[PDB]
Design an enzyme around this catalytic site. Structure first.
Site, PDB file in Angstrom:
ATOM      1  N   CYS E  65       0.904  -1.142   0.000  1.00  0.00           N
ATOM      2  CA  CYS E  65       0.000   0.000   0.000  1.00  0.00           C
ATOM      3  C   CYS E  65       0.946   1.195   0.000  1.00  0.00           C
ATOM      4  O   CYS E  65       2.151   1.006  -0.175  1.00  0.00           O
ATOM      5  CB  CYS E  65      -0.988  -0.018   1.187  1.00  0.00           C
ATOM      6  SG  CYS E  65      -0.369   0.043   2.871  1.00  0.00           S
TER       7      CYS E  65
HETATM    8  O1  RBL Z   1      -0.407   3.457   3.116  1.00  0.00           O
HETATM    9  C1  RBL Z   1      -1.586   3.170   3.331  1.00  0.00           C
HETATM   10  C2  RBL Z   1      -1.990   2.504   4.649  1.00  0.00           C
HETATM   11  O2  RBL Z   1      -0.850   2.300   5.500  1.00  0.00           O
HETATM   12  C3  RBL Z   1      -2.654   3.473   2.280  1.00  0.00           C
HETATM   13  O3  RBL Z   1      -2.050   3.468   0.967  1.00  0.00           O
HETATM   14  C4  RBL Z   1      -3.327   4.851   2.546  1.00  0.00           C
HETATM   15  O4  RBL Z   1      -3.938   4.881   3.848  1.00  0.00           O
HETATM   16  C5  RBL Z   1      -4.417   5.181   1.486  1.00  0.00           C
HETATM   17  O5  RBL Z   1      -5.003   6.458   1.773  1.00  0.00           O
END
Ligand code: RBL
Ligand code: RBL
Ligand code: RBL
Ligand code: RBL
Lengths: 172, 142, 142, 172, 172, 142, 172, 142
Positions: E65
């Site tokens: 992510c």
């Molecule tokens: O890094 C993240 C979670 O740790 C996600 O990509 C993010 O919250 C998306 O808005």
């Protein structure tokens, strides 16, 4: 409404753009096409999308490859499907209104994203309007092919080819 | 080189012009619709039958939108028909796909453009190689 | 709504078809070429002159390839002519550009597609706003 | 041969693809169009490409924006230029062979990259075939506009509009 | 060997790059993460990848992510999983060799693709080297959480939250 | 503001340095490992227990590689621990995630970088809003 | 303030992202680096950016290549420049505050876009604060190299190498 | 294989550990700073001089941030120094660049990571070929 979508590796980025748009429009999307850009084969995804539509898992389907010819033809070669290859809005609307096409094929790589969005939107917004004339055309089209139970709902249908590929039979 | 052509009422006019073009360029043409076919299903299937039974590997179907002739003819086992409305697909479908025939929509594509599309299609040979797996998959389907 | 139209010898046929179409669909049409113009330079300039002098903001130029009419009329200070071959530009050029006229090539675009293109163009209004900076720039050029 | 190319922020990625191709083909490229995807104005780059061609710094020019209309129209509105707006191979070849067009315009958001490549190659491969007929057309075209010395080779030509833009005059 | 991979919408492009690499390397890939870039939720894909590994459908998993924290934490919160959040080669190798981690997490928006490729390759190339010391650590880790049968292999596990999301409960 | 800290034998040295740092910069610190923990499982769980019981929402776990402490503490229902090696995650994990604690590996991250990471983490608040759906999902897991 | 930026073909996309961000922040950008992704040479752009800064055409410079090492080193090898290679926020801030670095180098391909944005922002937001200690370090650094008038402001400096490249001397 | 090492007061501790590591792995080490150098300019230049005059093609400079040693040493004609803080650049700078030396910031990079970086750097040879043009360009600069 549920839209099934698929693609080969040449147009995964264009598929992603359309998937995003469909979801923003409120459609539920079933992405079948390939998920990355690793070399693969368009018939695999065209068949998957075709069956989602034919089996009632999806209302309509959209398939794309470089030109769209390969994947849309693969989709068309399935029971219950009338796949229309349309790189323009005019024929796409015709496809839905006159032939009640349930699978739309587009050539990523040859049609720009903005026009692809227009084709998809026009296709979806169109509605099939039965007439004695097109009902007859549709009936003819639905009875050209001879059903093959070995192909219907068989995800392993192309395994023999996939093995030959893994074994280098299809080298350039 | 042999070329099979066919058309319904909407594609007849262009079919006739192209036939003249083809003859002027030394192509041996097999016209399966001297008179317009009842509809595009009849014309597209007529072209398909003549093609799959002939030694020709190039064919052109004419109707109002192209979509119909391709949708219908592609239902035939072993057939591969490409709707073509621009100059890249004109050659790429032959190079990559079996493109046993191309379909032109007379209400979509202008004559001068249709001729460029047709000539590019006729001038391009199938590349085989890696592309054969996809053709093998298509010919296996109904 | 008003629509200015014109054509050279190659686009005359479609121009006549579209005129009848527009009349049937409640459109006041100003045909500046009741008889085919000498060439696309004459027809495009005729349409431009009539447009930049009338209270209409929509115009359609017909010729063989579209490119010529646009190339010619765009030389006129203040004019903005868009060659249109597909359905996205049909509306976007009106929405973003001054799109005072669209040019259709009869050797490129089929009649059915031409009608969809025309209808989209006629049904779209200029968005103004940020786009105006670009139109001011264009109108400032020769 | 030298090809000058330009674009607005909507099609910078498509411009990069064409720039790459031209260089692989052996052409020298002068990239004028915008270099990133920050909102800017097509006339700026259309004018820059036009002047490169008109002044002899480039042999031919290619300009692109979403639809191609804006930037190709800007390119056309310059001395010594005959800009051809072509989203297809057929008219592009006609433009070069009959109208000796020296600037090609393409809609990077409506035409797929593979077709854009085909249009560019076809246009470049084509050769102007002079005849008394087209020479008359071309001469008429070259004489429609009235030369404005204040525009010719004037880099500050659009400053007035840019200042207004920075002043928020063109808000939405 | 089978590698299950997943991701949220922020790093779909980086996931595609890794999926491509894994296949070129001969790995079979099960792509669970989101397929487009439409706003979605990392726990969904982290859980899917985790269960693939825990149930034996995949040998190892990779999740990404923006920062990797969200999805790797979700993957860790599942039975049979030891997820290692590693934006570097060094700790990734340690994770595999000492903690026998079976799910690798990476921040696709903070690590460049070349380094992501290096982390993945290093992690896959590494082999768990059991010792009484690390076996004790691993056993302790496998016994921290209390198994919840309602979560295990439950596809509807997050339905409650998704409904609220559709109901606008989670607005900004 | 309050900050909970803890470390095993490998992260003890830096933990001691950071404690002194935090004290000097007006920070009430709760050191749950005045003496190095047996291992990172013991230290991370100690920090988690103290955190999920105190009124503080910031915590720092120190060990050799960071990964271990996060892997361990994240097994605790309701806990969210982020391994942090660079300055973007330092603040983003707090802004988007529940980031109840960050884990720093002393064999991976140098002291000066660790201080910047820590400061960014401590200076950032949870944004809430849409991000809550993800935190609710996580807290629902084992 | 004016920021000059450059890059080689490996990181043009990352450069574009930073250019966009800089403009949104209110900076005037002078893009020198390569504009497309056609194979080219990092020293060319590093030198261009370096001279913009040294000649006062730009206040600061930012250069990127796969790792950043090549282009930042090229930038450093110019009169009036102190180029800092920083793939992290901490050393980038140190570079500006202590060494008054006027050129920032970053490794696209190894640093994720979000972190690249943070590095750039931190670098720009930082301010040089002279101290007897760093003033002495800076003076030493500014006097290590021997000025070469043949290199200074000479855009043809690498022409001999470029010809050898065109002639296949540098084949793999 | 020969390896030249040097460090200022901030990088001395790590330099000593690495020297021990290198000797244990059969590397012939040339330490130009048995005692910490006055500053990183002195240490980095000392390493550069020893390197460009020796038959060794690998060197490691240690200071607090790495940035300084690279900034200073790269001013020397013919020298190419890479600041390295992650494992990809560790080998890529050797493969593509002349990477006559790498610089490690002890306040940035932890010891365990530094060792992986160092070993990858030492294990990688310059690829030459197309990369030589860039090195030729760099060696031509001041
Ligand atoms: O890094 C993240 C979670 O740790 C996600 O990509 C993010 O919250 C998306 O808005
Ligand atoms: O367009 C296609 C088939 O019609 C495919 O994208 C192409 O063959 C892949 O090389
Ligand atoms: O297509 C264009 C002009 O014809 C531009 O891309 C558009 O106006 C940008 O908003
Ligand atoms: O990182 C680089 C130089 O340090 C370049 O991007 C690479 O060499 C291109 O192949």
């Amino acid at each position: 409404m549920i839209i099934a979508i698929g693609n080969d590796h040449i147009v995964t980025m264009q598929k992603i753009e359309i998937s995003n748009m469909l979801k923003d429009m409120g459609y539920t999307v079933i992405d079948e096409g390939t998920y990355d850009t690793h070399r693969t084969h368009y018939p695999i995804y065209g068949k998957k999308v075709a069956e989602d539509v034919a089996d009632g898992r999806a209302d309509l389907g959209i398939v794309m490859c470089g030109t769209g010819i390969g994947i849309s033809t693969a989709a068309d070669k399935n029971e219950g499907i009338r796949a229309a290859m349309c790189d323009d809005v005019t024929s796409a609307v015709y496809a839905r209104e006159q032939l009640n096409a349930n699978v739309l094929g587009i050539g990523g790589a040859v049609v720009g994203v903005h026009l692809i969005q227009d084709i998809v939107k026009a296709y979806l917004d169109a509605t099939y309007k039965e007439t004695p004339e097109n009902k007859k055309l549709i009936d003819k089209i639905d009875n050209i092919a001879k059903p093959n139970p070995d192909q219907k709902d068989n995800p392993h249908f192309f395994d023999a080819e996939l093995e030959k590929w893994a074994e280098g039979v299809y080298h350039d | 080189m042999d070329v099979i052509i066919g058309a319904d009422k909407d594609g007849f006019a262009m079919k006739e012009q192209v036939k003249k073009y083809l003859e002027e360029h030394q192509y041996r043409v097999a016209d399966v619709t001297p008179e317009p076919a009842e509809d595009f299903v009849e014309s597209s299937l007529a072209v398909t039958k003549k093609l799959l039974n002939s030694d020709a590997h190039k064919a052109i179907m004419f109707d109002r939108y192209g979509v119909g002739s391709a949708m219908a003819s592609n239902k035939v086992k072993g057939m591969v028909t490409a709707v073509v409305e621009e100059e890249n697909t004109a050659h790429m479908t032959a190079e990559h796909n079996g493109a046993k025939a191309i379909a032109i929509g007379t209400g979509i594509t202008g004559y001068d453009r249709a001729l460029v599309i047709i000539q590019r299609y006729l001038d391009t040979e199938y590349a085989g190689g890696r592309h054969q797996i996809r053709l093998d998959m298509l010919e296996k389907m109904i």
